[PDB]
Symmetry: D2
Subunit: 191 residues, 4 copies
Amino acid sequence: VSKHSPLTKRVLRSYSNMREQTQDLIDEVQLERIAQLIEDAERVYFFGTGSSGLVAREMKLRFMRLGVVCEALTDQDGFAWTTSIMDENCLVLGFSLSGSTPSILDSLLDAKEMGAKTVLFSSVPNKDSQAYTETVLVATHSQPSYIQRISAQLPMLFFIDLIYAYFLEINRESKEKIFNSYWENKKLNGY
Amino acid sequence: PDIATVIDSHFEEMTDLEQEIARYFLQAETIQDDLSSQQVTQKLHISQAALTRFAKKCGFTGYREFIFQYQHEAENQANQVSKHSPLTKRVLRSYSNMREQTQDLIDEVQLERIAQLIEDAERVYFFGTGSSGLVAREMKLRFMRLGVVCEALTDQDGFAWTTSIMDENCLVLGFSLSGSTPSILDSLLDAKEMGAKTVLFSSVPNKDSQAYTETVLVATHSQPSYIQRISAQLPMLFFIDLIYAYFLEINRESKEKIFNSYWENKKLNGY
Amino acid sequence: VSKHSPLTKRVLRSYSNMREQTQDLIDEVQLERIAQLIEDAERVYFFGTGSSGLVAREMKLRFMRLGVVCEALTDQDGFAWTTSIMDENCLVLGFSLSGSTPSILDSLLDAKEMGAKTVLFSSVPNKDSQAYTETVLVATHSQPSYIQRISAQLPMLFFIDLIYAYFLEINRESKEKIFNSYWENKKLNGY
Amino acid sequence: PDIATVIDSHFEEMTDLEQEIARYFLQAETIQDDLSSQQVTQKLHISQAALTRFAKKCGFTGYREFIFQYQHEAENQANQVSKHSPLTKRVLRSYSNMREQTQDLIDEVQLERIAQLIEDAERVYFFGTGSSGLVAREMKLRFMRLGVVCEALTDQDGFAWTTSIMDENCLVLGFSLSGSTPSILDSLLDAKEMGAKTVLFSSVPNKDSQAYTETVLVATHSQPSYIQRISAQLPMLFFIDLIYAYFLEINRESKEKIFNSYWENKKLNGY
Ligand SMILES: CC(=O)N[C@H]1[C@@H](O)[C@H](O)[C@@H](COP(=O)(O)O)O[C@@H]1O
Ligand SMILES: CC(=O)N[C@H]1[C@@H](O)[C@H](O)[C@@H](COP(=O)(O)O)O[C@@H]1O
Ligand SMILES: CC(=O)N[C@H]1[C@@H](O)[C@H](O)[C@@H](COP(=O)(O)O)O[C@@H]1O
Ligand SMILES: CC(=O)N[C@H]1[C@@H](O)[C@H](O)[C@@H](COP(=O)(O)O)O[C@@H]1O
Ligand SMILES: [Cl-]
Ligand SMILES: [Cl-]
Ligand code: NA
Ligand code: NA
Ligand code: NA
Ligand code: NA
């Protein structure tokens, strides 16, 4: 009976606490370090499932537009056939909020065995995480019950946007040129 | 500047009693005890006035100020920009700005009314392109687990073939942040001509909006340039999460049962 | 050194033998029977993985255009959340050329337990196939080795097109109207 | 009309010997024995002329005709339209017609030349919409397991962003059956202007074709009306399967190893 209902209040609070939490978790030298891993990589891959898969889909879109040669895969067979053709010049970002999705975990090791660098985003620390090149711990939702939780993508979209910012300032002139081409008059499939 | 040093500095200025109270506060473990100016006064068998005198001898206006600084020193640590990088501060302020923006835009009776439209609908459809496509896909994933019969479409061909099999019992939620994607906008009119309810999620108050059952104004990003803009999904996820919360509380017992069926032991394709 | 190379010959022969084989397998009263199951169903679903998934994708496209309310799903979680909201008025077509993909098999039973009618397309007869409402045996590829085989979709696209033909002639006037709407002048998203 | 009855009918017309040969052929198990007119003549200790006389007494022009009808009766069964339904005959004739059509259109040195373009390319892309999108997706799935670095795209936004990061080392295979989908056609020119090789798969000899490194004429369907047309994928799958066969035999040892890696015991995400 005030500016907002108890339900509108609960949602907006979960968002606020996701920003406060994410702030206390930032390891800027890691986030920047990863941003450079993308640049120095021949091919980048984003593995994810469910909502963690939608997070992988957007990242492919955003970085492709900055000139990155990348793909997003969201199913086990895609991971397995993609891993079989990886090398040391590959980088894999694995998205698993629970830190337990077997397909996501096994793929990063598969990528590790083929020589590729491996990054893991998850809200739950584990010990297999040592095996990966980096492990970015994201925020945990503030709703105890799964059903009442806000979008599962958010803990990860926070750190995607930060890595995006650190990456964009690396040789930004070239990236911003590749990005504006979408609107260019010569472009025959543009806006 | 340590409050432990300040009491030690003034220890030899204090009367025989105030020197005893200094001992209490100088022990590192009193920080755990209750210090509400009555539990502390009892514990030491003293008067409040006694404690107040103690405080002013250490350099404070009263007891209330002293304990305030005394306690809060346990969590003082760093209060500057630990996240120094102004680029990091740029993203985080885009996120906070968005949430603040979102708050001002909420029409709570509209959002609930959309939540109801979803329930009464037989088939719900989500239309979106690019990043707005991911938003539509997530809404399908989230509301299907509450039992909603829905589909998510992200190409023009899909919209047209989906609109051709709609009727007055369908509902179409279209997602176009700019408010100008022709396929999304022309697909809502398509659906409306078939009798379907239509909702539009966009940050731009456009005039075509009037041709839809609902039009939800989401927030604009805070970055002038597109290239620096944070994810295009969020203006919409804010409101998606709000409609989901309203919707979830409509016949919740039913929905929670369908949502938990994913983890059912009888479920042959679950966890 | 003739009209065609030994390699062009091998491919075109595998196609021919796929038509000859498919012909000897047709159970017309079954194919037509299934065509009616689609009509009498409130909601139709197509489950498939890999190339069997692409076969499910096309079928959704073709039948949706005849006015069928249908969806195609190609991953385990999609199957599981879709099955949880099925009823006796649902029909599920499951596509598994090997007849062994665990996700596909378990979903049809899941659909069976929720009351939905279940159809299975596979080139290998099994005994769990008894549990399904129908079981359409398709042709087997004529190349011994997996790698040298022609497209994995074909054994199934044969029978999709036959069921499509039997279905289209059921109340064909209504379906053909729903189909031409794509090109209609009033249609605001058309051709 | 049974050949067993015919010999029985004429049994009492045959000489003492021809009645013995009737016994051989009347046994149901001789059908398994060798009957090349020399193994049969040996086995019975007879001359060929003897057998020929036997045949003409049963009603045949020679021994060769008799055994021909005699043997082939084991698999005679039904030779009419078991698949009676003329609708079923409609689909099957669309399929056969397609394969026949495809044969006449094959430019074997073009198809092999495309197979080579794929090998030399660093990044391969498949563009297609609707049913032509499924064709592009399957090609990605099939050639990735031979080690090819490839991606499949099925929306306009995807084509534009993909073309902007192409160069002279890329190859784009565009799939438009009609030969007139603007997004597919304008995306090949996009790629070409970036230096990429371009291939077009379409059934319509168009003149834009001249602006591409290759243009593959696939078959037209046999059904005038679209609604009755069988799957739109096939005209292209025919040629896809042909390019795959040519491509697979380029450095096969390497490719087969990458293909079998899916079933590797060391593979941590395989079978
Ligand atoms: C508990 C639960 O409902 N999980 C679902 C999704 O919420 C999640 O996005 C997906 C990937 O999970 P992740 O790999 O841990 O991110 O798995 C499940 O489909
Ligand atoms: C301005 C711009 O770059 N647009 C691109 C995406 O960022 C966007 O998500 C999509 C949908 O646009 P929307 O419908 O306005 O959300 O169109 C384009 O792909
Ligand atoms: C042996 C093999 O390589 N199988 C692959 C695909 O060819 C197949 O399409 C898919 C679904 O298989 P299905 O369910 O048997 O059709 O499984 C695998 O990804
Ligand atoms: C005539 C027609 O109905 N076209 C539809 C589909 O059948 C087709 O697959 C797709 C690509 O068309 P293509 O590029 O000519 O193959 O466009 C439309 O979705
Ligand atoms: Cl905030
Ligand atoms: Cl044939
Ligand atoms: Na939450
Ligand atoms: Na922003
Ligand atoms: Na074959
Ligand atoms: Na045809």
